[model samples]
Target: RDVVHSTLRLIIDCSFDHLMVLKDIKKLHKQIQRCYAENRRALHPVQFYLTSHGGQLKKNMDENDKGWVNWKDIHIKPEHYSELIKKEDLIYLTSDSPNILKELDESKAYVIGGLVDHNHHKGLTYKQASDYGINHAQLPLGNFVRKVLAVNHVFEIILEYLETRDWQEAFFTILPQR
Candidate 1:
């Protein structure tokens, strides 16, 4: 089963991205670029899904536009987040999930709850995941963790760890809170 589940696909559930005004979208957009710049060698073969507002990405278009990373690296779709993932393979990210993800072999894809709150709505992501009945797991960042992080940073940790299954490298490289 582990051999068959070697692929890791990340899903950003923008289906309820109303919480994010255009600015937050733009911020996450830049952080994703930073992930590429910081870890091109690491992200060369990773795949991702951006669900819901496929057209909203135009809000963050670059003028230097030949393109950014390979277009194949991203999958933008106007589908429901739950519809795209398998019930068995789903590992939704929520601060309340008791399971700590230490390996990429945890699942085939990770559904990152994508509702952004600029200092509002505590436990929003966890509540959303529970409402949908998706499996949730918080970042295993040891102790005294108070909050959730930006979308791309969370994505980067998962991808980085997938690239090199070192928890220290994955969590430490992107985490600034501790």
Candidate 2:
């Protein structure tokens, strides 16, 4: 049973490093680590990237998990995502967007905001993506159930979707029980 590694990129935009408190910043790091671990064991794993990986998030990862530097199959760089991915291929995933993502496109990179703001910084990611002229879309959760998903949950849901190719099954299996 060999794993099928994918070229589809899933990026965490960590540019909002200063917007969250220390605790939330650490939580984001934790969520990212969880995503890494899950992806490692997944039947099909997408390429994961953490962009703008500096400031408090870097410090937290440094002190908590120095092993991250040696990690393979994941990209952690200080470069902004736009510098790494073309604007045309970027699809920023923010709940603020009106566009509902009906399906995942393997050719495009999907970015998840790395901030945990308790709704304080609502619409910030959407605005930032728009300012950068990157496309934006929201997960098609309103059709079923939705949450301001934890960073890892979003990552895992994408993984599940890739496996099943059925949004409803992916959403139900990956999403926490209500």
Candidate 3:
């Protein structure tokens, strides 16, 4: 009954690429809400991991809108995906990777970014993953689907695919427009 202990794990590094300004232009709250909203709907289980600034972000959200995690008095909390991920069991997904994902593994962890720079941050996310020396891949999109997709949308599509193992169905369910 618990989706948190699902076979496939999803990691979102909430700390990368801040643009270093007084106010982050990423506007991460919207994407955070979107990811959690999708997590609530997925038919299959997905281990959720929000790294880096997750605790800080959770603090900013009010009690009523705390989204998926409660950071105040929770016995366990989301871990930082960077130092948190171990061994070859995890893979990082970034826009700069030449390798494309043909299929997703049920037992492995996947790391994505909450990167919301809207193209302003450039290749920072990829570099971060690369600097960390982790395995990374890009989406295998051809003329069939648009390469540009929101972070949450990608999570939803993967969740659906894990349940059905049908890429077209998953794509249609969440990516009909794009």
Which parts of model 3 have CA positions greater than 4 angstroms off?
1-5, 20-27, 54-56, 63-79, 176-178
Give the Cα error of residue 165 in candidate 1, in Å: 2.1
lDDT of 3: 0.66
Give the lowest summed-lDDT range of ten residues in model 3.
68-77
What are the TM-scores, per candidate, against the unseen true structure?
0.77, 0.96, 0.78
Error of 2 at 40 (Å): 0.6
Off by over 4 Å in 1: 1-6, 35-40, 55-58, 62-70
Candidate closest to the true structure, highest TM-score: 2
Better of 1 and 3 by lDDT: 3
The CA lDDT of each predicted structure is: 0.65, 0.89, 0.66
**Reference-based TM-score, model 1:** 0.77
- lDDT for each residue of candidate 1 in 1-178, tens digit (9 for 90 to 100): 1122225777777765566678776766676565444434454345567777444454454433237434544676778877777776777886667778665654466877665666577777777777877677877777634557777778778766766778777777877753
lDDT of 1 at 153: 77
